[PDB]
Design an enzyme around this catalytic site. Sequence first.
Site, PDB file in Angstrom:
ATOM      1  N   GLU A 187     -13.283  27.662  -7.865  1.00 36.86           N
ATOM      2  CA  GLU A 187     -13.308  28.352  -6.571  1.00 36.86           C
ATOM      3  C   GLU A 187     -12.684  27.544  -5.430  1.00 36.86           C
ATOM      4  OE1 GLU A 187     -17.134  30.333  -5.791  1.00 36.86           O
ATOM      5  OE2 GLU A 187     -16.319  30.971  -3.849  1.00 36.86           O
TER       6      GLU A 187
ATOM      7  N   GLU B 227       0.784  -1.255   0.000  1.00 37.43           N
ATOM      8  CA  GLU B 227       0.000   0.000   0.000  1.00 37.43           C
ATOM      9  C   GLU B 227       0.816   1.307   0.000  1.00 37.43           C
ATOM     10  OE1 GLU B 227      -4.197  -1.806   1.781  1.00 37.43           O
ATOM     11  OE2 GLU B 227      -3.744   0.276   2.196  1.00 37.43           O
TER      12      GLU B 227
HETATM   13  N1  LIG Z   1     -12.704   3.871   3.569  1.00 32.81           N
HETATM   14  C1  LIG Z   1     -12.770   2.803   2.739  1.00 32.81           C
HETATM   15  N2  LIG Z   1     -11.602   2.247   2.330  1.00 32.81           N
HETATM   16  C2  LIG Z   1     -11.613   1.174   1.496  1.00 32.81           C
HETATM   17  C3  LIG Z   1     -12.891   0.604   1.032  1.00 32.81           C
HETATM   18  N3  LIG Z   1     -12.583  -0.447   0.235  1.00 32.81           N
HETATM   19  C4  LIG Z   1     -11.222  -0.524   0.188  1.00 32.81           C
HETATM   20  N4  LIG Z   1     -10.656   0.432   0.953  1.00 32.81           N
HETATM   21  C5  LIG Z   1      -9.224   0.731   1.174  1.00 32.81           C
HETATM   22  O1  LIG Z   1      -8.565   0.841  -0.089  1.00 32.81           O
HETATM   23  C6  LIG Z   1      -7.292   0.189  -0.018  1.00 32.81           C
HETATM   24  C7  LIG Z   1      -7.258  -1.042  -0.933  1.00 32.81           C
HETATM   25  O2  LIG Z   1      -7.635  -0.642  -2.245  1.00 32.81           O
HETATM   26  P1  LIG Z   1      -8.972  -1.115  -3.009  1.00 32.81           P
HETATM   27  O3  LIG Z   1      -9.705   0.151  -3.403  1.00 32.81           O
HETATM   28  O4  LIG Z   1      -9.742  -2.125  -2.205  1.00 32.81           O
HETATM   29  O5  LIG Z   1      -8.360  -1.829  -4.324  1.00 32.81           O
HETATM   30  P2  LIG Z   1      -8.797  -1.569  -5.860  1.00 32.81           P
HETATM   31  O6  LIG Z   1      -8.694  -0.100  -6.168  1.00 32.81           O
HETATM   32  O7  LIG Z   1     -10.097  -2.282  -6.101  1.00 32.81           O
HETATM   33  O8  LIG Z   1      -7.539  -2.240  -6.638  1.00 32.81           O
HETATM   34  P3  LIG Z   1      -7.280  -3.853  -6.788  1.00 32.81           P
HETATM   35  O9  LIG Z   1      -6.009  -4.042  -6.018  1.00 32.81           O
HETATM   36  O10 LIG Z   1      -7.180  -4.048  -8.277  1.00 32.81           O
HETATM   37  O11 LIG Z   1      -8.501  -4.545  -6.243  1.00 32.81           O
HETATM   38  C8  LIG Z   1      -7.078  -0.181   1.441  1.00 32.81           C
HETATM   39  O12 LIG Z   1      -6.372   0.887   2.078  1.00 32.81           O
HETATM   40  C9  LIG Z   1      -8.474  -0.308   1.999  1.00 32.81           C
HETATM   41  O13 LIG Z   1      -8.503  -0.017   3.393  1.00 32.81           O
HETATM   42  C10 LIG Z   1     -14.122   1.274   1.525  1.00 32.81           C
HETATM   43  O14 LIG Z   1     -15.255   0.862   1.199  1.00 32.81           O
HETATM   44  N5  LIG Z   1     -13.976   2.319   2.355  1.00 32.81           N
END
Ligand SMILES: Nc1nc2c(ncn2[C@@H]2O[C@H](COP(=O)(O)OP(=O)(O)OP(=O)(O)O)[C@@H](O)[C@H]2O)c(=O)[nH]1
Lengths: 54, 437, 428, 334
Positions: B254, B183
């Site tokens: 803005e 990450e």
């Molecule tokens: N706040 C919040 N964070 C999320 C959610 N779903 C995933 N995350 C966060 O997003 C990060 C992981 O990325 P994802 O958005 O799940 O992955 P993706 O963009 O689908 O990319 P892939 O790896 O191809 O699946 C982590 O830090 C998770 O905590 C959500 O519904 N709410």
Amino acid sequence: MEVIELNKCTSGQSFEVILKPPSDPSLEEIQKKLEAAEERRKYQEAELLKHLAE
Amino acid sequence: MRECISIHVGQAGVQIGNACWELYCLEHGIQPDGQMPSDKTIGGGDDSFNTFFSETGAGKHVPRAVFVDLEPTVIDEVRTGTYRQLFHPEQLITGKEDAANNYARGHYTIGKEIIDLVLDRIRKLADQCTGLQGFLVFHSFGGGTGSGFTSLLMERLSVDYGKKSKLEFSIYPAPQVSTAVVEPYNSILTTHTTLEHSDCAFMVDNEAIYDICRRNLDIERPTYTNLNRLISQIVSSITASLRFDGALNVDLTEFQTNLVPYPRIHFPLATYAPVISAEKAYHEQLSVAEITNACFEPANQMVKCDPRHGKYMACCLLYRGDVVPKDVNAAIATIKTKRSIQFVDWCPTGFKVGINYQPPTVVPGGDLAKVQRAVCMLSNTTAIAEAWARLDHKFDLMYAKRAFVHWYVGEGMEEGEFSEAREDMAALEKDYEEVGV
Amino acid sequence: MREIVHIQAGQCGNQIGAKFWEVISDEHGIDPTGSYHGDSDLQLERINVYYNEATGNKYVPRAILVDLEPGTMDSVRSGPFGQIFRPDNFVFGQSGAGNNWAKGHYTEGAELVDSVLDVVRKESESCDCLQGFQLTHSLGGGTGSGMGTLLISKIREEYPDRIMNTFSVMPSPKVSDTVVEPYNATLSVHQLVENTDETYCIDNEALYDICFRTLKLTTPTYGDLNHLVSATMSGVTTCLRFPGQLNADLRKLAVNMVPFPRLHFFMPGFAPLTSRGSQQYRALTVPELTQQMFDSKNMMAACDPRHGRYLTVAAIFRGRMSMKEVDEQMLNVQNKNSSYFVEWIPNNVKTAVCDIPPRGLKMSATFIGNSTAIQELFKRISEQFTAMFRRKAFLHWYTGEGMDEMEFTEAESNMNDLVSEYQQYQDA
Amino acid sequence: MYTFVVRDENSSVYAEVSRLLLATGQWKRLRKDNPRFNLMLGERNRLPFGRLGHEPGLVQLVNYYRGADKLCRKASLVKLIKTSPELSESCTWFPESYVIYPTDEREVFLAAYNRRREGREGNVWIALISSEASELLDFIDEQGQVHVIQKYLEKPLLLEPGHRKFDIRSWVLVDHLYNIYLYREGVLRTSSEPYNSANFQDKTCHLTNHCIQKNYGRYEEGNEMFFEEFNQYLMDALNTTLENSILLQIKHIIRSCLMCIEPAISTKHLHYQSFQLFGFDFMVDEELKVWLIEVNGAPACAQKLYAELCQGIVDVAISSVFPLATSIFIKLHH
Ligand SMILES: Nc1nc2c(ncn2[C@@H]2O[C@H](COP(=O)(O)OP(=O)(O)OP(=O)(O)O)[C@@H](O)[C@H]2O)c(=O)[nH]1
Ligand SMILES: Nc1ncnc2c1ncn2[C@@H]1O[C@H](COP(=O)(O)OP(=O)(O)CP(=O)(O)O)[C@@H](O)[C@H]1O
Ligand SMILES: Nc1nc2c(ncn2[C@@H]2O[C@H](COP(=O)(O)OP(=O)(O)O)[C@@H](O)[C@H]2O)c(=O)[nH]1
Ligand SMILES: COc1ccc(/C=C/C(=O)c2ccc(OC)c3c2OC(C)(C)C=C3)cc1O
Ligand SMILES: [Ca+2]
Ligand SMILES: [Mg+2]
Ligand SMILES: [Mg+2]
């Protein structure tokens, strides 16, 4: 201290309060970069298939 | 009236998108089927809500939104869920295989194959716009799609829509609710590629929201649903001025003018109060002074950092509910004397204030209690660089051993891009440094 | 991507493979005929990962059964869930491998391999989005070891962008068929380092030790050993088989667990350890699960984790429990024993919880560790190899199939490199 | 088990603190860059405060207050005293001071220097010490650093026998709850050569540091007079106590300085917590009036007192957050 720019409507209002005064790449460059990555991919798989053929 | 298009990328963007569009519907009195009886001009017009919704002859109010994901799991839940009639199938774009938490796979490999389809479906919405002003982009930093594909899309939108503004709602990675060990890598990679292409970006640290849910909503172990309902309230607060009558932050340009004097330093801190549990049996309602004071407590911010040990470049206060200017000014004068609020020398010590009389809408059966008044503060403070420092250090720890780098190189990314991305981050940390101390 | 193609090769491969299909069918509510007689829809949501849907509510394992001998594959076909497998997926020779890697890899197996690959292709074509392959096999015999590794190599030629996962049973003198096992294992490890993305190291030494030292069983049979293999195999596949918080797959496991491509040999663990039949009546608490699943006594590879460092860990908890308490206990292990986790991979432990517990356990925990201590397994094999090879003992069994001594030196060299590669990160 | 990291090797106070913690058998020391700690004994400069309090399942504490350097650098201390309404210009316990820059308040300084000359009264200043303003301004520009010019205390309290100058060092611990604890033992860092009224170049009798002295050790061991002896001297010579004549003013100054900065530095509602040990340096004039000289953000203890103080830091600052199985501090109530 000083309130300015006060605008009011039925939905709400907005204003500014001042407490104190003061003292890109082209389409061609993206498409070239993305295709350059594919040429690195193609080469690495071709090297694997050469290794496996050996 | 000038239209905005919302783009939701990867899992996080899509799920937050759902939360926000659920809220927008409940705010404007738009039904799950798209009907809006309070709208008396059937099948068109140029009201303030038309910024986010177009209209059909039958009276369906449809979001100016595109959902994009590289795997179909999450968007299928939009396709079948309680708000399915709202979007037409062309707005919901899926692939077969995700980016496997890999920036390079999201950007270069799977990115290349789906980008032209996405831009075409974006062009479809842009053609229905009399005066498109720009884009609201929802994504994670941590995901492979959220990081990799977003940065690619953002590059192309600069080429296809040079005149338009681009705004981000970005989810900063937290170990408490993490998906991937890489990450930090994806975060630095996306930030570096997106930096010249984003005009204003609102970061939400999953750690901050998690702990807000635990402390203020009494939720033992917060789900994504818990986090997203809270985020949607903050997003709604930020976008209310685009969707309603008023004279502050009425266009996307803005947001840059009011919050971003230094173009690189384009990450305003959001702070929100009050967050109250629906399960709380007895609640003493909080005043203008109390909620405005809460905007300067670390515990309430979207990113945990310390604004006292930084400097401000701008400050917006966005109120919803029973609030009058007199009470705002009384609250500010008291806070200014009690708190460490240092502006930069080349900026006025001031607050731009917007009030909307409609109190926040809560999702029926949610965790948030109805409140008489609420506030979202948007401050561009150098203290937010604390988050870049944290993230860059985790990047450094991994990259010292070249750990996991081969997964990125394997997708056809040169290793030099890692150090290029990191040097830019070091340059950003220095920019904040100069302005801040 | 969701579909997995399962291949089981040789005696061990087929015996652990059959047990895997017995266990996960019961979990998913599938009977020997292939009919779903379950109750929860959660059993069906991700059933297409391992099963192909057939004519009329019947579920067919996406499984290919391979041997050079007809023996074991007759025992599967006549076994408990024997009827569930697709008859055309039985691919067998006649002459056997005689515990000879060279027969598996170069002579006997080379004659049968194209036939297996025709069945692999037919299963691959049925897939909406194939994610990869899992193989069960031992490294000590001839068919699982020699032909299994040949298969992996040919599958990688045909599907170079798919994941290769293996369950690889490591030989031990404690539970030994022949003296030549260290040769077969070393030749095999050489192939696995190059051609797999993920390998679960299933050590027969550890399995014997757990059965004898811990489970009170004074003479462990293959059946007792395989009770541990199936409990581990069920646990490591849980998040692929059930809806979860993460939407787990084989590729994401690789990206997140493997910091360096060669270092992909995982140390699995299980808690609680039980023997067959005799059910324990007291359920384990979350502090007990967490303590046991990290203890050496519960590792499926005979390596002391305190002799090395964890690069990455994945852990999967099963049963109705406090997910908060799981977070607290897992963080407790890491914060109290932080010396045993590399500081240069931040947050290197990921945990999932699955509601559905395995049969006969209210509470369970499966460990997947990428530890540097796994070098102990490869050193043990390497020493046994050397003691024979320095005298060229038993080599004629291999030279008779056209193998040279040079191939033996290279395999040994590569496995020693792997050992030093692990050591490099144990000190850094 | 609790965990800690040691990130300042040169600190004797926290060498002893870490040693005492280990001795409990409930504190394990980790590597410099191990993020999974309960306690950080941090580096003096560039301490990464922004990386603290972001570790799930760990309560994190640091032995430094972010922002406390404003009190603990000469330049900023003056600016803080001059600008804070709680302290102000007419601050009776801080000598007249001016910020001087070399390539700012020089025109403010020299205009007040004229009042000292036109009144013809005592006109000695410190940066080295001179009676003429432009004498050391030629030494300020020569140094190229932002040093403050301060009114020199021309009539100090002098110990007998010896006719000597001195300064008082006070150790002050501020815990995570912003309780202000004055250590009951302070130290007088004495001169050994008699105070010369009209010879400012003679640095040994004018500057009372432990390094400059090391007649060294003549009157008392290592030029250090403690509180029992000084109180007895004040009873014998001046018919007063240390408590009444001096300690009331010291307790007032410490409370005033740390109250002033409290909203800027407090960790009351933060994601991480701070404590900090301070060294306040006091001068006493002949009429028993106590003056603040400076504040030390990274102080060293006196040799006799190391063990007792370092245990106290473990007692009220560390074990208060992280519990285990008389007080040497005077609580400065607010
Ligand atoms: N706040 C919040 N964070 C999320 C959610 N779903 C995933 N995350 C966060 O997003 C990060 C992981 O990325 P994802 O958005 O799940 O992955 P993706 O963009 O689908 O990319 P892939 O790896 O191809 O699946 C982590 O830090 C998770 O905590 C959500 O519904 N709410
Ligand atoms: N305005 C003043 N009037 C009289 N004496 C003064 C003075 N300013 C400084 N001094 C003397 O000079 C000595 C050193 O001054 P200062 O405290 O600035 O240096 P320093 O920072 O090295 C001491 P420490 O080791 O505690 O940090 C003091 O012990 C004091 O006696
Ligand atoms: N754990 C386990 N190991 C086995 C089993 N059968 C054979 N082995 C091991 O596998 C090796 C012999 O290989 P085998 O699979 O019989 O040969 P193949 O038929 O040529 O693959 C030896 O190390 C045996 O101990 C089994 O059912 N369980
Ligand atoms: C060190 O951080 C991590 C380590 C591993 C993962 C794994 C992500 C998965 O997609 C995945 C795939 C297969 C699995 O079974 C073998 C698992 C699996 O991950 C979980 C659901 C947590 C548990 C098991 C992610 C990391 O961040
Ligand atoms: Ca209309
Ligand atoms: Mg995804
Ligand atoms: Mg056999």
